Amino acid sequence: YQHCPFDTLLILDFETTSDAANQDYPCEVIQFAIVAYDVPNDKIREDISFNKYVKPVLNRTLTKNCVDFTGIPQRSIDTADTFDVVYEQFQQWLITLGLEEGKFAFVCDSRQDLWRIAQYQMKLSNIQMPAFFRQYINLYKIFTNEMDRMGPKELSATTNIGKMNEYYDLPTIGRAHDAMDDCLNIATILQRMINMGAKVTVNELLTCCASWRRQPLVYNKEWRSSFMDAGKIFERVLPLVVTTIRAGDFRLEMYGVCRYCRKGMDVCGTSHQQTPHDLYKNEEDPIHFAKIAGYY
Amino acid sequence: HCPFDTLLILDFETTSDAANQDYPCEVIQFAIVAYDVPNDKIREDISFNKYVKPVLNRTLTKNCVDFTGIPQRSIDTADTFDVVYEQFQQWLITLGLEEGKFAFVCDSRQDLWRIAQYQMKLSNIQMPAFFRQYINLYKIFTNEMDRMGPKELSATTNIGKMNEYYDLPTIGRAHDAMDDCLNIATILQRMINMGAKVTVNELLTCCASWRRQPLVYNKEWRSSFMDAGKIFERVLPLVVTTIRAGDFRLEMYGVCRYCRKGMDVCGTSHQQTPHDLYKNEEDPIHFAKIAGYY
Ligand SMILES: [Er+3]
Ligand SMILES: [Er+3]
Ligand SMILES: [Zn+2]
Ligand SMILES: [Zn+2]
């Protein structure tokens, strides 16, 4: 009677440097937050947690509109360690907790945290994308299936967390976009979803290849002022791409194996299989975030 | 009368973020235009114009791009200040100028008292004697309005007001360093021709007794240019001292006005370190911290 094949789910959330009006921005992690959920005992473990500020190297001074959005003050990032150091602490934390790779999974509220943010930051820091970041549970996508299954209803909230909270009629915990408060909301929503009979398992995988990247991107000249169109650019720039999987077709043994090429994930990923050369040739209108990360 | 054979009109643009004044401004454009004094000749063909790549804030905020007009690509293909600065140094020698016989000219005290001084802390370059005496064109202008009589001016910036007064057309666009530079040379020209005393009127000094007493702290300073000025004044080792029109003398290069020492001696340490400002690590001063002032 556990649909969820993992013993422990790790609710994950990143906050990043940003500049609202500009999507051609090299987001760097400024907050790394995780809270554990005990699957067999159905318990949110608020005492098993990871919560560190991260110091950027590219944009060391937080945009004012970034501190208003995230609530993070400049002092907390000036005393923080850089990402390579905070990432290694995280690695160390997993170890002390005795988590067997492939028997835990990360839970996020959208594709953004792992497909975009982890990938890009990891490129900046020259760290290989780990297997446990290459499969995950997009809780928003399970949520949308749960709506279809139980009955859609009118939602006024604008964020994924907000909507889920509204639909299950849960009270918002803390403030929006404070990473740890985001984690506790997600954990709570997740717990509610499970008690309502949802099957919570990995639904998104990161993959070297997609056939819709075979067709070149039809370029929007004004992509820098739109989150959606910038997403499309990120999709072509980043080596890995999101492939979905149905709940019944997922297997724990897929861990560490690329869904597309079937190679091990210590091999797959090391070079871009679909480099978007068509976007890298107009030297007059360059993509800043691709340049600064060394994609060209 | 004006004791310099050649005047160098210097302007900087920096990284910024309009609504945050606790910001580590970095040079992104460095422009200079020569002015021949004996020939009264603005020399547009003797110039320095370079973009500079930041290291703290590599991505220009949108509002910085809007304000300065500089696009991200021009900064991504540029060298860092240390390289651009050695280029500037190399360019100087090209001009064959006699030591202490040229002076810099700015529209305000910002370019050299704040921007150069701070950038040069970041880059670990010693503040040069020729940046510790300069001509603040606006102060002279202020004085020219007493002599020649006032006007009600609706213009908004130092360069704007001066152009309005001397009834001069705006050259190029505001906040392009070179465009700023040309307007300043042009204004400088009319001023001299209308009878202005043009000389070094501002000196950079190790010490001033108005930093003896701690600053009256304003919790909301980060949203005000004026109030952030006050804290910049305490953080930076060198402070602006004023010298009257007739009083400057060529051989003041480069001895510090306060302590009378050579400007290789005076200059190394901060003689008035504002310890009282560096005590509340629940409200720290970001620009002082990234620069290593504490
Ligand atoms: Er978040
Ligand atoms: Er300027
Ligand atoms: Zn693959
Ligand atoms: Zn001195």
mmCIF file with all atom_site columns, C-alpha atoms in Angstrom, chain B residues 18-119:
data_model
loop_
_atom_site.group_PDB
_atom_site.id
_atom_site.type_symbol
_atom_site.label_atom_id
_atom_site.label_alt_id
_atom_site.label_comp_id
_atom_site.label_asym_id
_atom_site.label_entity_id
_atom_site.label_seq_id
_atom_site.pdbx_PDB_ins_code
_atom_site.Cartn_x
_atom_site.Cartn_y
_atom_site.Cartn_z
_atom_site.occupancy
_atom_site.B_iso_or_equiv
_atom_site.pdbx_formal_charge
_atom_site.auth_seq_id
_atom_site.auth_comp_id
_atom_site.auth_asym_id
_atom_site.auth_atom_id
_atom_site.pdbx_PDB_model_num
ATOM 1   C CA . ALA B 1 18  ? 19.407 52.215 -9.382  1.00 0.00 ? 18  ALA B CA 1
ATOM 2   C CA . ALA B 1 19  ? 17.460 51.304 -6.205  1.00 0.00 ? 19  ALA B CA 1
ATOM 3   C CA . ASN B 1 20  ? 20.445 49.940 -4.288  1.00 0.00 ? 20  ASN B CA 1
ATOM 4   C CA . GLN B 1 21  ? 23.104 52.376 -3.202  1.00 0.00 ? 21  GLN B CA 1
ATOM 5   C CA . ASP B 1 22  ? 25.114 49.763 -1.186  1.00 0.00 ? 22  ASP B CA 1
ATOM 6   C CA . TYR B 1 23  ? 26.664 48.759 -4.482  1.00 0.00 ? 23  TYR B CA 1
ATOM 7   C CA . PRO B 1 24  ? 30.292 47.945 -5.469  1.00 0.00 ? 24  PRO B CA 1
ATOM 8   C CA . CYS B 1 25  ? 30.446 50.176 -8.578  1.00 0.00 ? 25  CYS B CA 1
ATOM 9   C CA . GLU B 1 26  ? 32.820 48.862 -11.204 1.00 0.00 ? 26  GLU B CA 1
ATOM 10  C CA . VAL B 1 27  ? 34.117 50.760 -14.231 1.00 0.00 ? 27  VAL B CA 1
ATOM 11  C CA . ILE B 1 28  ? 32.570 49.619 -17.504 1.00 0.00 ? 28  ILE B CA 1
ATOM 12  C CA . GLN B 1 29  ? 33.661 52.463 -19.763 1.00 0.00 ? 29  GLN B CA 1
ATOM 13  C CA . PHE B 1 30  ? 36.710 54.629 -19.431 1.00 0.00 ? 30  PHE B CA 1
ATOM 14  C CA . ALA B 1 31  ? 36.887 57.713 -21.693 1.00 0.00 ? 31  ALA B CA 1
ATOM 15  C CA . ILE B 1 32  ? 39.301 60.624 -22.046 1.00 0.00 ? 32  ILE B CA 1
ATOM 16  C CA . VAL B 1 33  ? 39.493 63.568 -24.482 1.00 0.00 ? 33  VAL B CA 1
ATOM 17  C CA . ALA B 1 34  ? 42.495 65.934 -24.755 1.00 0.00 ? 34  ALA B CA 1
ATOM 18  C CA . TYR B 1 35  ? 42.220 69.729 -24.766 1.00 0.00 ? 35  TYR B CA 1
ATOM 19  C CA . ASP B 1 36  ? 45.064 71.918 -26.023 1.00 0.00 ? 36  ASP B CA 1
ATOM 20  C CA . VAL B 1 37  ? 45.244 74.968 -23.771 1.00 0.00 ? 37  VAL B CA 1
ATOM 21  C CA . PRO B 1 38  ? 47.596 77.388 -25.717 1.00 0.00 ? 38  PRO B CA 1
ATOM 22  C CA . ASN B 1 39  ? 45.681 76.670 -28.961 1.00 0.00 ? 39  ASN B CA 1
ATOM 23  C CA . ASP B 1 40  ? 42.240 76.508 -27.380 1.00 0.00 ? 40  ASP B CA 1
ATOM 24  C CA . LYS B 1 41  ? 41.640 73.310 -29.287 1.00 0.00 ? 41  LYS B CA 1
ATOM 25  C CA . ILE B 1 42  ? 39.385 70.372 -28.352 1.00 0.00 ? 42  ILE B CA 1
ATOM 26  C CA . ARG B 1 43  ? 41.361 67.478 -29.733 1.00 0.00 ? 43  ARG B CA 1
ATOM 27  C CA . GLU B 1 44  ? 38.873 64.686 -30.619 1.00 0.00 ? 44  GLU B CA 1
ATOM 28  C CA . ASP B 1 45  ? 41.598 62.721 -32.445 1.00 0.00 ? 45  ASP B CA 1
ATOM 29  C CA . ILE B 1 46  ? 43.630 62.365 -29.244 1.00 0.00 ? 46  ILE B CA 1
ATOM 30  C CA . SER B 1 47  ? 41.397 60.148 -27.142 1.00 0.00 ? 47  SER B CA 1
ATOM 31  C CA . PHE B 1 48  ? 40.913 57.034 -25.075 1.00 0.00 ? 48  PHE B CA 1
ATOM 32  C CA . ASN B 1 49  ? 37.682 55.077 -25.184 1.00 0.00 ? 49  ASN B CA 1
ATOM 33  C CA . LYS B 1 50  ? 37.430 51.598 -23.719 1.00 0.00 ? 50  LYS B CA 1
ATOM 34  C CA . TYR B 1 51  ? 34.892 49.224 -22.333 1.00 0.00 ? 51  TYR B CA 1
ATOM 35  C CA . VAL B 1 52  ? 35.755 47.425 -19.137 1.00 0.00 ? 52  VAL B CA 1
ATOM 36  C CA . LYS B 1 53  ? 34.698 43.974 -17.911 1.00 0.00 ? 53  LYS B CA 1
ATOM 37  C CA . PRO B 1 54  ? 33.645 43.817 -14.212 1.00 0.00 ? 54  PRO B CA 1
ATOM 38  C CA . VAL B 1 55  ? 34.609 40.940 -11.893 1.00 0.00 ? 55  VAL B CA 1
ATOM 39  C CA . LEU B 1 56  ? 32.100 41.368 -9.048  1.00 0.00 ? 56  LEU B CA 1
ATOM 40  C CA . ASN B 1 57  ? 28.993 41.962 -11.138 1.00 0.00 ? 57  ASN B CA 1
ATOM 41  C CA . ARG B 1 58  ? 29.486 40.452 -14.589 1.00 0.00 ? 58  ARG B CA 1
ATOM 42  C CA . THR B 1 59  ? 25.914 40.895 -15.816 1.00 0.00 ? 59  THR B CA 1
ATOM 43  C CA . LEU B 1 60  ? 24.721 44.493 -16.191 1.00 0.00 ? 60  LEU B CA 1
ATOM 44  C CA . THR B 1 61  ? 21.358 44.992 -14.533 1.00 0.00 ? 61  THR B CA 1
ATOM 45  C CA . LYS B 1 62  ? 18.699 46.066 -17.002 1.00 0.00 ? 62  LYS B CA 1
ATOM 46  C CA . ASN B 1 63  ? 18.464 49.440 -15.353 1.00 0.00 ? 63  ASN B CA 1
ATOM 47  C CA . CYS B 1 64  ? 22.209 49.926 -15.801 1.00 0.00 ? 64  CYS B CA 1
ATOM 48  C CA . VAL B 1 65  ? 21.820 49.024 -19.509 1.00 0.00 ? 65  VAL B CA 1
ATOM 49  C CA . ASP B 1 66  ? 18.906 51.474 -19.844 1.00 0.00 ? 66  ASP B CA 1
ATOM 50  C CA . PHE B 1 67  ? 20.754 54.315 -18.057 1.00 0.00 ? 67  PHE B CA 1
ATOM 51  C CA . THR B 1 68  ? 24.246 53.958 -19.638 1.00 0.00 ? 68  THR B CA 1
ATOM 52  C CA . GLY B 1 69  ? 23.156 52.597 -23.039 1.00 0.00 ? 69  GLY B CA 1
ATOM 53  C CA . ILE B 1 70  ? 25.959 50.007 -22.884 1.00 0.00 ? 70  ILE B CA 1
ATOM 54  C CA . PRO B 1 71  ? 24.926 46.522 -24.112 1.00 0.00 ? 71  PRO B CA 1
ATOM 55  C CA . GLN B 1 72  ? 26.087 43.265 -22.442 1.00 0.00 ? 72  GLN B CA 1
ATOM 56  C CA . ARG B 1 73  ? 28.139 42.093 -25.426 1.00 0.00 ? 73  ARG B CA 1
ATOM 57  C CA . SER B 1 74  ? 30.443 45.166 -25.282 1.00 0.00 ? 74  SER B CA 1
ATOM 58  C CA . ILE B 1 75  ? 31.301 44.272 -21.732 1.00 0.00 ? 75  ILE B CA 1
ATOM 59  C CA . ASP B 1 76  ? 31.627 40.502 -22.358 1.00 0.00 ? 76  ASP B CA 1
ATOM 60  C CA . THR B 1 77  ? 34.345 41.120 -25.008 1.00 0.00 ? 77  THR B CA 1
ATOM 61  C CA . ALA B 1 78  ? 36.326 43.629 -22.877 1.00 0.00 ? 78  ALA B CA 1
ATOM 62  C CA . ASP B 1 79  ? 39.343 43.374 -20.648 1.00 0.00 ? 79  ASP B CA 1
ATOM 63  C CA . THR B 1 80  ? 39.237 43.858 -16.858 1.00 0.00 ? 80  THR B CA 1
ATOM 64  C CA . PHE B 1 81  ? 40.093 47.187 -15.247 1.00 0.00 ? 81  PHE B CA 1
ATOM 65  C CA . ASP B 1 82  ? 43.726 46.196 -14.502 1.00 0.00 ? 82  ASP B CA 1
ATOM 66  C CA . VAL B 1 83  ? 44.341 45.616 -18.204 1.00 0.00 ? 83  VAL B CA 1
ATOM 67  C CA . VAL B 1 84  ? 42.429 48.674 -19.418 1.00 0.00 ? 84  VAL B CA 1
ATOM 68  C CA . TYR B 1 85  ? 44.284 50.711 -16.783 1.00 0.00 ? 85  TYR B CA 1
ATOM 69  C CA . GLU B 1 86  ? 47.715 49.605 -18.016 1.00 0.00 ? 86  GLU B CA 1
ATOM 70  C CA . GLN B 1 87  ? 46.458 50.499 -21.530 1.00 0.00 ? 87  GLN B CA 1
ATOM 71  C CA . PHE B 1 88  ? 45.514 53.982 -20.259 1.00 0.00 ? 88  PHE B CA 1
ATOM 72  C CA . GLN B 1 89  ? 48.991 54.240 -18.663 1.00 0.00 ? 89  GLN B CA 1
ATOM 73  C CA . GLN B 1 90  ? 50.601 53.228 -21.950 1.00 0.00 ? 90  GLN B CA 1
ATOM 74  C CA . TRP B 1 91  ? 48.450 55.748 -23.841 1.00 0.00 ? 91  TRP B CA 1
ATOM 75  C CA . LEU B 1 92  ? 49.557 58.561 -21.504 1.00 0.00 ? 92  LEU B CA 1
ATOM 76  C CA . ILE B 1 93  ? 53.236 58.015 -22.374 1.00 0.00 ? 93  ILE B CA 1
ATOM 77  C CA . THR B 1 94  ? 52.246 58.157 -26.063 1.00 0.00 ? 94  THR B CA 1
ATOM 78  C CA . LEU B 1 95  ? 51.055 61.752 -25.560 1.00 0.00 ? 95  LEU B CA 1
ATOM 79  C CA . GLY B 1 96  ? 54.486 62.918 -24.356 1.00 0.00 ? 96  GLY B CA 1
ATOM 80  C CA . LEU B 1 97  ? 53.143 65.076 -21.539 1.00 0.00 ? 97  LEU B CA 1
ATOM 81  C CA . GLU B 1 98  ? 55.307 66.819 -18.949 1.00 0.00 ? 98  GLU B CA 1
ATOM 82  C CA . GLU B 1 99  ? 54.815 65.623 -15.349 1.00 0.00 ? 99  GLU B CA 1
ATOM 83  C CA . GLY B 1 100 ? 52.430 67.928 -13.410 1.00 0.00 ? 100 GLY B CA 1
ATOM 84  C CA . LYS B 1 101 ? 51.724 69.938 -16.617 1.00 0.00 ? 101 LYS B CA 1
ATOM 85  C CA . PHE B 1 102 ? 48.440 68.164 -17.336 1.00 0.00 ? 102 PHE B CA 1
ATOM 86  C CA . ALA B 1 103 ? 45.297 67.901 -15.235 1.00 0.00 ? 103 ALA B CA 1
ATOM 87  C CA . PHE B 1 104 ? 42.085 65.886 -15.361 1.00 0.00 ? 104 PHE B CA 1
ATOM 88  C CA . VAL B 1 105 ? 38.681 67.445 -15.732 1.00 0.00 ? 105 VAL B CA 1
ATOM 89  C CA . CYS B 1 106 ? 35.392 65.960 -14.541 1.00 0.00 ? 106 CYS B CA 1
ATOM 90  C CA . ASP B 1 107 ? 31.772 67.056 -14.317 1.00 0.00 ? 107 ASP B CA 1
ATOM 91  C CA . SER B 1 108 ? 31.693 66.320 -10.566 1.00 0.00 ? 108 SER B CA 1
ATOM 92  C CA . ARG B 1 109 ? 33.707 64.800 -7.717  1.00 0.00 ? 109 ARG B CA 1
ATOM 93  C CA . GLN B 1 110 ? 32.223 61.322 -8.442  1.00 0.00 ? 110 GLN B CA 1
ATOM 94  C CA . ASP B 1 111 ? 34.566 60.091 -11.189 1.00 0.00 ? 111 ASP B CA 1
ATOM 95  C CA . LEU B 1 112 ? 37.799 60.397 -9.183  1.00 0.00 ? 112 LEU B CA 1
ATOM 96  C CA . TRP B 1 113 ? 36.912 60.715 -5.510  1.00 0.00 ? 113 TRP B CA 1
ATOM 97  C CA . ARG B 1 114 ? 34.463 57.773 -5.539  1.00 0.00 ? 114 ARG B CA 1
ATOM 98  C CA . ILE B 1 115 ? 34.705 55.696 -8.743  1.00 0.00 ? 115 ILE B CA 1
ATOM 99  C CA . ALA B 1 116 ? 38.459 55.679 -9.417  1.00 0.00 ? 116 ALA B CA 1
ATOM 100 C CA . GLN B 1 117 ? 39.360 55.425 -5.765  1.00 0.00 ? 117 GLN B CA 1
ATOM 101 C CA . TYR B 1 118 ? 37.046 52.438 -5.190  1.00 0.00 ? 118 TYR B CA 1
ATOM 102 C CA . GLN B 1 119 ? 37.760 50.622 -8.449  1.00 0.00 ? 119 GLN B CA 1
#
